[PDB]
Design a protein around this ligand. Structure first.
Ligand SMILES: Cc1cc(/C=C/C#N)cc(C)c1Oc1nc(Nc2ccc(C#N)c(F)c2)nc2ccsc12
Ligand SMILES: [Mg+2]
Lengths: 556, 416
């Protein structure tokens, strides 16, 4: 006997105030009972479970499931109730590595750690809550009562306790072999290195020797799995990676469900396939969530899908991360609030790709959206590579400096350089800081009756120009915008505009270049056409003539 | 040497806040710092039975060259009991803001000499994350009073009063205030002697420390007696255009929400007709009289303005351009307790967010000196831009609360 170190036990509690499960054992056929008795006898010899006396008051149902195309039965203990009352744990696999942050490896081995999983003991004070009962033959004897001594399959805490136990065992081996990497996933350890294959597997046997300390055995006949690996949706290769094949179905009619898989596949493919777009295909699902409803695909959505089919026509591969080189991120505008990007270190060899979609709002502009895309790529890059990439952006240095120095909010984007690949982001209008000399001055106002919805909008100017337009199905806020629209329509290339609408100011001072409101969009297109516009605000009902005059004209 | 029992507020569990992503250099800085702390017994590895978490990152204090561990205990502080068992609450020294020099000391390392209640330690769990999740996060919990936790200065106050008792009796004119990891030491002496009156303190707690603090050497010096305010000022002109008078009336109308007798009809009556914005308008004497009376009103304090310690302080900030920022602290709208202005945004000529980040810390520092607590900020910035970058320029050991303003206020014009 070679002594083996015990595996440190994790103390487990139930949720505060909760007691263990007390669920009644379903009746079973005599055939299933004999099956479970033989299965549980083997596990008792293996030490996985132990018979208990009648004093234990807890119970969890056990089932026998007939396997497909076999004469053998499997055992299933249903820990759904116990899981509801087991304390929360620290789960470690919430974050999973992205292949673009991995490093190139010459050799990668896979070792099965499934028998090692059962050397992890369950907290002795907690085992009583895992009790289950095999029903007896003809219900004429007391049922056989067992409790688990090891982490039960399907129990809430088994994944977290298992990997945290393996990590503790593997830590000194990894720390004293910094020329290999070890990563655990499910029942498998992955060991990679850049060593010549000779030394690489001495290290593998050194890992099996280290695992023997705790009596953990790995299969001698080496694993059947080898590069490439099919892992969490990717294809991992020695020096490149890709998502698993993306196949878009052919359909003459698409349902609500049919589009959510298509967008799902497109979202997954967008991390390496450049330029994937999902706007017109996601729009077809807004509001409605009727799994069966068929949706006519707009010719916009048909074009977007056809554009995606052309991009997905072949495998596209990305490379792994080289910490000795810079990260470069490059963004393009796609239209309709869509942005696509590539992240690379050497030209034409992307590490990964991605996309960003405009947030939902009443108004927006391209500079705000590009800024948000930069922040998303920045955070993703901190996640994946632990650094911010240098950016190449479709915006001139002069446009950005004009934007951030005049914008009312604080804003910043990290180190970047202009790349001249249209469509470029630009500023479409710039309001003046001081009133314009020689330009006609427009005093605008509008009002509406909150019951009849009837309103008026118009202006009066210093040259005697006047207009009042009667309106139907409108509001006070809409008439205040229409009045500004009229003054822009009827003025020359330079104009001063005086309004009392705090609502209109707040919109225009946000500097949008596109809006959900077709009236704001019309104002924007008038602003683009002007050379100089000074927009001044005065308070309402305060004796300010021009304002007061048109106030009476529109509120009559 | 004895642990004081600490528990959370009734019906509340420990914090479960996600660690945000960290750069490589902060991760490695935290590994070095936490490895030594584990050797010195300050922290200990924890297993998966601990589900709680509090975010951690690393900073560099103002002109320091080595990283400092900073834990965002804002959620744990909200969930921790409030300490009134020994003291009903230290009455905030109103005389601290009147001293001509106030030095801020990082006495946070002193809290590591006091053990933490063993039943409460699970709630201080934090995670050093890994890049790309290529290894499990390094999980720790605290065995001693942690820096940044509101219960650390409350428990250690037992000790702290006894450490500086020789100093307080030797120097009865020096005002000493403790907020979190900070010690605010105020005096009216001469500048040269002020340092002299700082190191002496410093040498004390290093003498109690050897019976070395990695940041006790430094002093952040202020002068709250020369803290300037911002009353409401109206222009003084010889030629008023229509635009000037419209801006003036708009400003006086906003001030009328704050002041009682503001009046604008004589000034508004000059704006009779439909005149060009750049046309010069002579003032009637009724208008100048009205302007003169409004000017006198704006030189008096605001009526009914009092600080209530039971209510939150609120700080608004406006970007004014050219590196200038205005701010107002209040508890109810139009009842400003302090207003100010900063053109002193250091090393950030090309960075709006660094400027805003230094202004936030500047306003918080003033708020601690005056009222002994931090305000909730209304920041003129998008949530996504601020949360991406503020930790890069943070140099204080506390962290306030903040919300975000997405609609441009008209009020920027009135403090411009
Ligand atoms: C070794 C391994 C295996 C897997 C197994 C997946 C499955 N099915 C997963 C991870 C995350 C793995 O971990 C890593 N891998 C890589 N580099 C890499 C390079 C080439 C190949 C190939 N061929 C590869 F597999 C991985 N770098 C790092 C750096 C820190 S840990 C890690
Ligand atoms: Mg009106």
């Amino acid at each position: 006997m070679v002594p083996i170190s015990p595996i440190e036990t994790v103390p487990v509690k139930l949720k505060p105030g909760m007691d263990g499960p007390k669920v009644k054992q379903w009746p079973l056929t005599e055939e299933k009972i004999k099956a479970l008795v033989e299965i549980c006898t083997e596990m008792e010899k293996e030490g996985k479970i132990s018979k208990i006396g009648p004093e234990n008051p807890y119970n969890t149902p056990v089932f026998a499931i007939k396997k497909k195309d076999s004469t053998k039965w499997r055992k299933l203990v249903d820990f759904r109730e116990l899981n509801k009352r087991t304390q929360d744990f620290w789960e470690v696999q919430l974050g999973i590595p992205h292949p673009a942050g991995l490093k190139k490896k010459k050799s990668v081995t896979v070792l099965d750690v499934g028998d090692a999983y059962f050397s992890v003991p369950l907290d002795e004070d907690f085992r009583k809550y895992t009790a289950f009962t095999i029903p007896s033959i003809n219900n004429e004897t007391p049922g056989i009562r067992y409790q688990y001594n090891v982490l039960p399959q399907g129990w809430k805490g088994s994944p977290a306790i298992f990997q945290s136990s393996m990590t503790k065992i593997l830590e000194p081996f990894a720390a004293q072999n910094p020329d290999i990497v070890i990563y655990q996933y499910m029942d498998d350890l992955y060991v990679g290195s850049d060593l010549e294959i000779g030394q690489h597997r001495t290290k593998i046997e050194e890992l099996r020797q280290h695992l023997l300390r705790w009596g953990l055995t790995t299969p001698d006949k080496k694993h059947q799995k080898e590069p490439p690996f099919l892992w969490m949706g990717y294809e991992l290769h020695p020096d490149k990676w890709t998502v698993q094949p993306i196949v878009l179905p052919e359909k003459d009619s698409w349902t609500v469900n049919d589009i959510q898989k298509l967008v799902g596949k497109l979202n997954w493919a967008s991390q390496i396939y450049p330029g994937i777009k999902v706007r017109q295909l996601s729009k077809l699902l807004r509001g409605t969530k009727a799994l069966t409803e068929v949706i006519p695909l707009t010719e916009e959505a048909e074009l977007e899908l056809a554009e995606n089919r052309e991009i997905l026509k072949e495998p596209v591969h990305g490379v792994y991360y080289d910490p000795s080189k810079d990260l470069i991120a490059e963004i393009q505008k796609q239209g309709q609030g869509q942005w696509t990007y590539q992240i690379y270190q050497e030209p034409f060899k992307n590490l990964k790709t991605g996309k960003y979609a405009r947030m939902r709002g009443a108004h927006t502009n391209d500079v705000k959206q590009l800024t948000e895309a930069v922040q998303k790529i920045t955070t993703e890059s901190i996640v994946i590579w632990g650094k911010t990439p240098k950016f190449k952006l479709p915006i001139q240095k002069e446009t950005w400096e004009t934007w951030w120095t005049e914008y009312w909010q604080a804003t910043w984007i990290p180190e970047w350089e202009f790349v001249n690949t249209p469509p470029l982001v630009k500023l479409w209008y710039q309001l003046e800081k001081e009133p314009i000399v020689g330009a006609e001055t427009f005093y605008v106002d509008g009002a509406a009756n909150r019951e009849t919805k009837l309103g008026k909008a118009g202006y009066v100017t210093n040259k005697g120009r006047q207009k009042v337009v009667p309106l139907t199905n409108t509001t006070n806020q809409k008439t205040e915008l229409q009045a500004i629209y009229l003054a822009l329509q009827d003025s020359g290339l330079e104009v001063n505009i005086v309004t009392d609408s705090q609502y209109a100011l707040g919109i225009i001072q946000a500097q949008p270049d596109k809006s959900e409101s077709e009236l704001v969009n019309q104002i924007i297109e008038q602003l683009i056409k002007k050379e100089k516009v000074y927009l001044a605000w005065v308070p309402a009902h305060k004796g300010i003539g021009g304002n007061e005059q048109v106030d009476k004209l529109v509120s009559a | 040497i004895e642990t004081v029992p600490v528990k959370l507020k009734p019906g509340m569990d420990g914090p479960k806040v996600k660690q945000w992503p960290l750069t490589e250099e902060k991760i490695k800085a935290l590994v070095e710092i936490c490895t030594e702390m584990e050797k010195e017994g300050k922290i200990s590895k924890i297993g998966p039975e601990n589900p709680y978490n509090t975010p951690v990152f690393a900073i560099k204090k103002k002109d320091s060259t080595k990283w400092r561990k900073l834990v965002d205990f804002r959620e744990l502080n909200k969930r921790t009991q409030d300490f009134w068992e020994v003291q009903l609450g230290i009455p905030h020294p109103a005389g601290l803001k009147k001293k001509k020099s106030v030095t801020v000391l990082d006495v946070g390392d002193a809290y590591f000499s006091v053990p933490l209640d063993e039943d409460f330690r699970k709630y201080t769990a934090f995670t050093i994350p890994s890049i790309n999740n290529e290894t499990p996060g390094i999980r720790y919990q605290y065995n001693v009073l942690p820096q940044g936790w509101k219960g650390s200065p409350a428990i250690f106050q037992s000790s702290m009063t006894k450490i500086l008792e020789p100093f307080k009796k030797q120097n009865p004119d020096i005002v000493i205030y403790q907020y979190m990891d900070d010690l605010y030491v105020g005096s009216d002496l001469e500048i040269g002697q002020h340092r002299t009156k700082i190191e002496e303190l410093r040498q004390h707690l290093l003498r109690w420390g050897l019976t070395e603090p990695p940041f006790l050497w430094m002093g952040y010096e202020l002068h709250p007696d020369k803290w300037t305010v911002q009353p409401i000022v109206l222009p003084e002109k010889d030629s008023w255009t229509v635009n000037d008078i419209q801006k003036l009336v708009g400003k006086l109308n906003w001030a009328s929400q704050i002041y009682p007798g503001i009046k604008v009809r004589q000034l508004s009556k000059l704006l009779r007709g439909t005149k060009a914005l750049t046309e010069v308008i002579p003032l009637t004497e009724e208008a100048e009289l009205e302007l003169a009376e409004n000017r006198e009103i704006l030189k008096e304090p605001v009526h009914g303005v009092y600080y209530d310690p039971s209510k939150d302080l609120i700080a608004e900030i406006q970007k004014q351009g050219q590196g200038q920022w205005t701010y107002q602290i209040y508890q109810e709208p139009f009842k400003n307790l302090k207003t100010g202005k900063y053109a002193r945004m250091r090393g950030a000529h090309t960075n709006d967010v660094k400027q805003l980040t230094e202004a936030v810390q500047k306003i918080t520092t003033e708020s601690i000196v005056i009222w002994g607590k931090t305000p909730k900020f209304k920041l003129p910035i998008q949530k996504e831009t601020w949360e991406t970058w503020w930790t890069e320029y943070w140099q204080a050991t506390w962290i306030p609360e903040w919300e975000f303003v997405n609609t441009p206020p008209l009020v920027k014009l009135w403090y411009q």
